[PDB]
């Protein structure tokens, strides 16, 4: 009884969500909407990927439909989201991934198209936010349109939840060394809003401001007003690492932190929070489905009330898998 | 008696043309037009450069004008090129560098604005093409709108002229390993027209097609229909190298080729064609004003009628200096 | 009846040969010799790879032996190759991959250790050279020590053989845009022999001289003295492309060249020479086992007697697979 | 009355120290010792630089001596430091920059060669440590052999001194995003001691451990046992940024921190500690002689007792200038 899923927008997040859905098999993709991309271009884009390699399967175009592993997918090219006939294709859930419809009113334009529930793959100002393994038990069948927050937030939230539940975080500051994204540009370029983001991505570091640590307090209400930070954008393909410096109420040696993190990674947070002790680097976490992997050897502790923790997280993947897992849990709650 | 120069578009070519004009002092910039960039953003963009470093001088904004080294520059923000009041600012020549007005009819929209002559910093379908040091003596004061072809063409043309004048090129194929440009994109991305150009610039090589070697036959009429080739786009900041494989009529040892190239580089083509024998790499030619520099040690010769020549050329700079030199020669012919 | 294979040196070529042998299953690895690497370091090096990703299997160390997929491997740490007890481990063939024993006299030091035949994974001055699919039928059971030439040579030889057999290459010049290797260095550095190779690999192009096209005439005797060229070293992880500019005796349109290349790629040279018509880039050929893949859209033809051909080849892989295939053919001839 | 300076080792630090000494003109270089580099190779290495560009001056070799700007320099090629005739060349101070003679006993081998005082351009276990602008007034003419600590330490120490003097740092954790160095290697490689450092520098982030924040407590005795941290090695040419997260005794808004940092940067710490408010990136600090530049817009403050500060520092340069400034102050104290 897999739910029917339509995808709005065939960008990096939409293609990776489709790839993760076909690899895991938890949900079924029946419809893809993109107005600027024709069918053969979507075949070429889904077939070849520079970062994650070639697709393991058969993808082609026939009868005006995108056939992936023998499964036909109806293609729409409507710019206005209110005109898309989601109910004609039979799609029950709709993943909004264009990044321009983030408010509840804008994302509610899929409702008159025949869609039941809309999941936004972006942070939202007013839609409820859910992170798998942290607060996903708060979801109700009354929540038609929700949000999966952001990848960084998805990296920070389970580790922060475990550390706050075991030792009581007083306050913390987070720094995330981030890989390059589609919004950056080569050889400098223009960028009215953010002047730093318009510089050349290949030759620079480029500090930036983010609100993921502030969104952690939205996801976990006890940590509201205790977490904030910034980011660096280094020229890496698809690996980012989160660094969290925090102060704790109860004394905690580094071995106790490692023990409780490994214990949480084994049972309750299996598949979400990872644990390792090897001498790993960034490219060892390519195409990893974990939301975050705790690095035991990388972190350092100044004292029992002042520590610093390091976590690896894949930007492209992982989140897509959390979107698929959230849709599966939503279908299970139906 | 320096000529007054206005610049349309403040992109990479326009900023570098302004920088080269202020460094050399041959011409004077009195007007800059760009509709999407405000004045403080142009101050920030001209002040800081990721590739060529900080500007050697004083740049600021005062009284709604851009003051560079004590020289005020009037700023226009007109999208339609026919509405720009070039004659009000006193600009005599206009450098069209936006890359969207390449035909004679489109570039003639600056004529009713009060401009006398328009120089296009791009290849053109119907405007006459001039390369400094090769065919710039063919220019007439009757030529209001002309073109400076392309940088690659500007790299290939003097070396090909010298080799054809000394040994009689029968036919040749050219390959140019090119640095990244503003049209490429990080982390793959979309590109309807050219599907290869939409892939990730950081992780790929990306073969491409170019018409610079075909434009050499337009500049040099005796070589028409004898030169064609392609290109590779490697992730380099701003250095490209041209490789030319050719067949000659008269026998020519490699020492004779080196001798005639050094002799041509010394006298007639001083400052345009360079010559070196050191063990150089690409970053040794950063901020070099030469159109092309012949690498003696890099090339190889199969036999006296079949050789391969290597030339280094800076993409960002050099061309801008050739635009400034062409404008100076145009003002001298007046 | 798989042959027993020992590997001398656990560098990039030795590890990739072991990986290809365990993936294909044609031969069996029973012994690895390296004096500078301890056992746990070899476990860590074989387990994690930055370019080709994690190993698909189980690798561990037990009883002083390297266990890969349940197969134990004896480990030697002898610096002098004459003291290695190859016959004690039961290894019949020995792959010499350290790159310092390339002559016949130096590579013959494995013979008194109990090894029967020695295969050098490097170009050799006096050992016979064999390329799979080109001249591998010339091998005799009298040839104990031979060579597999080089990867570039392995890329160039089948395409050149097909083009020479169909159209009669008169002469040709080859340029190969190469990825970075272990001999290069970051942030410049020292390099007495080659001054260009000591410069910084990340920021430069670095022309270099190679003898692969000269070695093609050693492999194919009819093309002796007709092929020579050079190379460029761009900062790419593991993808290189070969560009060959050639003159032909019989007239040949580009469609006929594409037809004969596709026909040769289908039947006789299946798995060695590849053919494609898609808009591919370098990272599309990551972990590809083909020796060379002909790019139909990338090449250009000046005329029926003057053409330019483009081929993609993986530096790390492919060659390792050709070493494994050559050892399998050698065992079949026994 | 400039002091005579000899340099041991012509690596990256020695060449940059010579370049900074010839650019500033505070000291005079009379002798260079390197056993593995011949004279023409040093001419080529000093003439061309991939990061900082070509040398602004004349460098050549004549009469077995290195002539820079008309100044001859005697060249030694002695491996054993005790055999170098420093007193024959007239050198009074000796800069030890090979990185293998860091103890007092090993660096004292230059004393019987005729040298008076030895300055180590590396952290030392037992030699006294001096940072310019922080504790350089503690130096005595009784200190023949001393140390200039490390560049990171030189970046962190003035900012930490200002913040501790104004607001009383309780404890702090430091993270520094570092550019690539000569010890890293391309395409992975071997690294017995540190397994993470042997991975490929181009494709990875590579966490590492450093003792610069622990050395700050050695330089500033009041901060002993209050500062520790780690590092990340991203593939950048020559720009690194320091991030310091700290807790303060007295309340401090971000505007007060900016005011006291700007006031300290203007008067007492002119030329050592920099201040900026522009939207800068890493490549804007290329060839900057400041030890550290405070970034006002990049940092963030959680509350009045918990802040995070960002500072930019050039790895190659700056330190070399601090070595030259320390030698000038040492000569002034004589």
Curated annotation (Swiss-Prot), chains A, B, C, D:
It comes from the Eukaryota. There is a cross-link at residue 185 (Glycyl lysine isopeptide (Lys-Gly) (interchain with G-Cter in SUMO2)). D-glyceraldehyde 3-phosphate binds at residues 150-152, 181, 210-211, 233. The modification N6,N6-dimethyllysine is found at residues 4, 65, 193, 214, 226, 259, 262, 333. GO terms for biological process: antimicrobial humoral immune response mediated by antimicrobial peptide; cellular response to type II interferon; defense response to fungus; glucose metabolic process; glycolytic process; killing by host of symbiont cells; killing of cells of another organism; microtubule cytoskeleton organization. Coiled coil: none annotated. The modification S-(2-succinyl)cysteine is found at residues 151, 246. The active site is at residue 151. Has both glyceraldehyde-3-phosphate dehydrogenase and nitrosylase activities, thereby playing a role in glycolysis and nuclear functions, respectively. Glyceraldehyde-3-phosphate dehydrogenase is a key enzyme in glycolysis that catalyzes the first step of the pathway by converting D-glyceraldehyde 3-phosphate (G3P) into 3-phospho-D-glyceroyl phosphate. Modulates the organization and assembly of the cytoskeleton. Facilitates the CHP1-dependent microtubule and membrane associations through its ability to stimulate the binding of CHP1 to microtubules. The [IL]-x-C-x-x-[DE] motif is a proposed target motif for cysteine S-nitrosylation mediated by the iNOS-S100A8/A9 transnitrosylase complex. This is Glyceraldehyde-3-phosphate dehydrogenase. It comes from Homo sapiens. The lineage of its organism: Eukaryota, Metazoa, Chordata, Craniata, Vertebrata.
């Amino acid at each position: 009884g897999k739910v029917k899923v339509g995808v709005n927008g065939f960008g990096r997040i939409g293609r990776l969500v489709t790839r993760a859905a076909f690899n895991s098999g938890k949900v079924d993709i029946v419809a893809i909407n993109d107005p600027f991309i024709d069918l053969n271009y979507m075949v070429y884009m889904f077939q070849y990927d520079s970062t994650h390699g070639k697709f393991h399967g058969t993808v082609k175009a026939e009868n005006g439909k995108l056939v992936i592993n023998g499964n036909p997918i109806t293609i729409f090219q409507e710019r206005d989201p209110s005109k898309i006939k989601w109910g004609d294709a039979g799609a029950e859930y709709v993943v909004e991934s264009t990044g321009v419809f983030t408010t509840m009113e804008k994302a509610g334009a899929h409702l008159q198209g025949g869609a039941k529930r809309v999941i936004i793959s972006a942070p939202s100002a007013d839609a409820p936010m859910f992170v798998m393994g942290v607060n996903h038990e708060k979801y109700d069948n009354s929540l038609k349109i929700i949000s999966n927050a952001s990848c960084t937030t998805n990296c920070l939230a389970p580790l922060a939840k475990v550390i706050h539940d075991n030792f009581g975080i007083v306050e913390g500051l987070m720094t995330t060394v981030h890989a390059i994204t589609a919004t950056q540009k080569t050889v400098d370029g223009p960028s009215g809003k953010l002047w730093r983001d318009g510089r050349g991505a290949l030759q620079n570091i480029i500090p930036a401001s983010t609100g993921a640590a502030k969104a952690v307090g939205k996801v976990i209400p006890e940590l509201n007003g205790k977490l904030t930070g910034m980011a660096f954008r280094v020229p890496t393909a698809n690996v980012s690492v989160v660094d969290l410096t925090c102060r704790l109420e109860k004394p905690a040696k580094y071995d106790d932190i490692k023990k409780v993190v490994k214990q949480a990674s084994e049972g309750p947070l299996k598949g979400i929070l990872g644990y390792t002790e090897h001498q790993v680097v960034s490219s060892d976490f390519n195409s990893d489905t974990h939301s975050s992997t705790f690095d035991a050897g990388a972190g350092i502790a100044l004292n029992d009330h002042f520590v610093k923790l390091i976590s690896w997280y894949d930007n492209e993947f992982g989140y897509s898998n959390r979107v698929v897992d959230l849709m599966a849990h939503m279908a299970s709650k139906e």
